[PDB]
Amino acid sequence: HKVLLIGKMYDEIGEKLLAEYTNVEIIKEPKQHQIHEAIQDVSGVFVRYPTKLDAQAIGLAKNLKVISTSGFGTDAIDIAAATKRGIVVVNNPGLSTTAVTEHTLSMILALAKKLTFLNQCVKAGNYLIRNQVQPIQLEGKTLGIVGLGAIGSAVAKICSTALQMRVLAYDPYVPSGKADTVRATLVQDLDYLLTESDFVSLHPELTDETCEMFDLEAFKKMKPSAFLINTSRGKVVRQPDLVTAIREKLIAGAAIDVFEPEPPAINNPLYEFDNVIFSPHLAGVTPEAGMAAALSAANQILQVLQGEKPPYIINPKV
Amino acid sequence: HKVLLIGKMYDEIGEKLLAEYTNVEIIKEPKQHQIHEAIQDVSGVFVRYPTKLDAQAIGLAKNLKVISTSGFGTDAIDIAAATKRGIVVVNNPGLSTTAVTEHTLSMILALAKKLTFLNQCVKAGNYLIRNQVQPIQLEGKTLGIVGLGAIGSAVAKICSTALQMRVLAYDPYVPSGKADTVRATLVQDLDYLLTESDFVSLHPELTDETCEMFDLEAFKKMKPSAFLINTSRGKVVRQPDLVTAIREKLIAGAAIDVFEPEPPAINNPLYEFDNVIFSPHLAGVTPEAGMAAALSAANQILQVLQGEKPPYIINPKV
Ligand SMILES: NC(=O)c1ccc[n+]([C@@H]2O[C@H](COP(=O)([O-])OP(=O)(O)OC[C@H]3O[C@@H](n4cnc5c(N)ncnc54)[C@H](OP(=O)(O)O)[C@@H]3O)[C@@H](O)[C@H]2O)c1
Numbered sequence: 001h002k003v004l005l006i007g008k009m010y011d012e013i014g015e016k017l018l019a020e021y022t023n024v025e026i027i028k029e030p031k032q033h034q035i036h037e038a039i040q041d042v043s044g045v046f047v048r049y050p051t052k053l054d055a056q057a058i059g060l061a062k063n064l065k066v067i068s069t070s071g072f073g074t075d076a077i078d079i080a081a082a083t084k085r086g087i088v089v090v091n092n093p094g095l096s097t098t099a100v101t102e103h104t105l106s107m108i109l110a111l112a113k114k115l116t117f118l119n120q121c122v123k124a125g126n127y128l129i130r131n132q133v134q135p136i137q138l139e140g141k142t143l144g145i146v147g148l149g150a151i152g153s154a155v156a157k158i159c160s161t162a163l164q165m166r167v168l169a170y171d172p173y174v175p176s177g178k179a180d181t182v183r184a185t186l187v188q189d190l191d192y193l194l195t196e197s198d199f200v201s202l203h204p205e206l207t208d209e210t211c212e213m214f215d216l217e218a219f220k221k222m223k224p225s226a227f228l229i230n231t232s233r234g235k236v237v238r239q240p241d242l243v244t245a246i247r248e249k250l251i252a253g254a255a256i257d258v259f260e261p262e263p264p265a266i267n268n269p270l271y272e273f274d275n276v277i278f279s280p281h282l283a284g285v286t287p288e289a290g291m292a293a294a295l296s297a298a299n300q301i302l303q304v305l306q307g308e309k310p311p312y313i314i315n316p317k318v
Numbered sequence: 319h320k321v322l323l324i325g326k327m328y329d330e331i332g333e334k335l336l337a338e339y340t341n342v343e344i345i346k347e348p349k350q351h352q353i354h355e356a357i358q359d360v361s362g363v364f365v366r367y368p369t370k371l372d373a374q375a376i377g378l379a380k381n382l383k384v385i386s387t388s389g390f391g392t393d394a395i396d397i398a399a400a401t402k403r404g405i406v407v408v409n410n411p412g413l414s415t416t417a418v419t420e421h422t423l424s425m426i427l428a429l430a431k432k433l434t435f436l437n438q439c440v441k442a443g444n445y446l447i448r449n450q451v452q453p454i455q456l457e458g459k460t461l462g463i464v465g466l467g468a469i470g471s472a473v474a475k476i477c478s479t480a481l482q483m484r485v486l487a488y489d490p491y492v493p494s495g496k497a498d499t500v501r502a503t504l505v506q507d508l509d510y511l512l513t514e515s516d517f518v519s520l521h522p523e524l525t526d527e528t529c530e531m532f533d534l535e536a537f538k539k540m541k542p543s544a545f546l547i548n549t550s551r552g553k554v555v556r557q558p559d560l561v562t563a564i565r566e567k568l569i570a571g572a573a574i575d576v577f578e579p580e581p582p583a584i585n586n587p588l589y590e591f592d593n594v595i596f597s598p599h600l601a602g603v604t605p606e607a608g609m610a611a612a613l614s615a616a617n618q619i620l621q622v623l624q625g626e627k628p629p630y631i632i633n634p635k636v
Pocket residue numbers: 110111112113114115116117129132133134252253274275276277
């Protein structure tokens with residue numbers, strides 16, 4: 001059996017696991033022709049997010065039996081083309097809770113302390129900015145969490161207890177006792193969260209219900225002094241609404257790690273604003289998180305080649 | 319009685335407290351001649367850090383009975399000239415523990431997530447940096463704390479419990495039980511802290527013993543992958559040693575909020591490096607912290623004018 005890695009894994013341990021049982025070829029940032037030639041006789045494919053696996057490549061891969069993404073997202077793979085050939089598409093979700101939690105805290109604190117802005121002011125000799133702008137004390141402020149899942153709960157717990165924040169959570173699919181557990185208050189009215197919050201951090205699953213759930217109307221209800229943090233999925237925010245909200249001062253700032261579409265263009269209208277900070281979809285990509293996802297991707301590839309059913313099938317009908 | 323504020327307070331509540339009992343004049347970023355004319359008939363003086371109160375101004379102030387700084391630092395005031403005239407010099411220390419704790423966490427997390435760097439990479443269209451640089455997971459890393467006082471203990475507590483870090487503390491004037499209380503380990507050998515730590519955060523009092531205690535030899539013992547965080551006092555670091563340490567990759571980065579001297583010059587050699595981030599001595603300057611220091615400065619000014627002894631006398635011999 002031969003296996004093709006389109007893009008490197010997040011940690012070489014998954015590659016050595018694969019090399020012990022299959023013939024592996026790795027290609028980095030490939031052109032389409034490289035993909036076409038290397039995929040023809042291969043049994044398994046790994047795809048480093050967010051590069052795309054199209055129907056032409058899938059059709060050219062005569063022996064292909066398993067496709068594994070690098071993380072949770074499967075929007076870059078032509079899943080329909082893979083199910084038509086009966087090819088298993090496999091996921092690697094939920095291995096980066098701690099990484100994203102830490103990343104969310106870093107971005108909440110960064111906005112609160114105005115870190116990126118005050119850094120340039122000092123590097124530009126404007127230390128006298130001490131007399132103009134002031135950092136925000138997180139203690140006693142209200143954090144609003146959209147989505148009280150694995151990451152939302154962990155962020156909720158740290159902010160209420162260690163950082164002494166009041167935390168509200170909006171999540172229609174969770175009991176109020178789950179908020180109590182992490183010292184938060186569940187709220188059924190998103191409006192109450194939006195009007196109450198000094199910081200809003202998005203952690204919901206991307207559904208039809210949450211797609212673009214943060215639009216202009218939401219940004220109007222938010223405090224003008226409040227900040228948005230999005231480490232969930234890019235589609236949760238209606239991007240031009242955020243541009244307008246930032247421009248017209250409907251909110252005070254933003255920190256985002258997830259874009260729509262991905263990769264974002266080099267002329268994205270949000271890059272202009274100084275009160276909007278960015279990270280290139282790395283909240284879940286620490287060495288520890290990458291090692292878990294790499295081992296998970298290798299394992300699910302091997303199990304399919306050995307006929308054992310893997311845990312994270314995206315198209316269980318095949 | 320008349321009172322002069324050289325620089326604004328960190329919150330207008332101390333000024334309204336003063337105006338209720340005295341005739342107040344406020345001057346912002348003044349030239350020396352403004353200070354000389356406004357100080358002659360005044361009974362009390364407030365000095366916004368870090369502007370200087372020199373012996374000429376103190377000699378021109380015939381009715382001056384109390385000088386209060388804005389915060390802990392008194393190095394900008396000619397204390398010797400004030401004691402020669404029997405003038406009380408008063409401090410306002412210890413009112414910003416929570417502010418500095420939060421600020422230290424923001425800077426530890428910022429360095430760990432490479433925040434300022436990854437922000438420019440996205441704003442410059444280099445989202446593909448995902449494949450080059452990776453953030454650091456704080457869980458299980460070793461934090462070394464120099465100075466287990468009010469702020470050091472609070473930082474220690476949050477990092478060991480909420481952030482799941484291993485914390486070592488070096489502090490010759492503290493029992494090992496104090497480290498146990500915040501889930502840290504006291505270490506008597508600074509070398510052990512330096513060689514063990516992935517992040518070193520400075521929180522000691524500035525003494526002869528701690529002055530420039532972080533020099534080149536210390537930076538050599540630190541891990542090349544480790545980061546320095548300094549929110550204590552600028553004199554704790556030998557500044558050109560840090561420039562050398564950063565240049566020659568003895569440490570991996572730095573986040574500093576306190577300079578030597580203050581204010582720092584516009585051509586400070588550290589501004590060049592991208593792995594060194596800055597804030598203009600604002601770790602203790604949140605609205606909540608400023609309001610406490612402002613009320614404390616007003617109160618100590620009024621008590622001296624009313625002959626009641628204030629709590630934070632710097633020259634108790636007068
Ligand atoms: N973590 C972040 O990246 C982050 C988060 C929030 C805010 N910020 C930035 O921080 C700055 C402070 O804004 P704010 O939230 O405190 O509200 P603000 O009312 O805009 O700022 C308060 C004071 O700072 C002045 N100011 C604003 N921008 C300035 C600048 N570039 N240079 C010098 N002075 C400036 C304002 O003067 P004028 O009204 O005359 O301009 C005002 O006197 C803003 O530029 C904002 O974009 C950055």
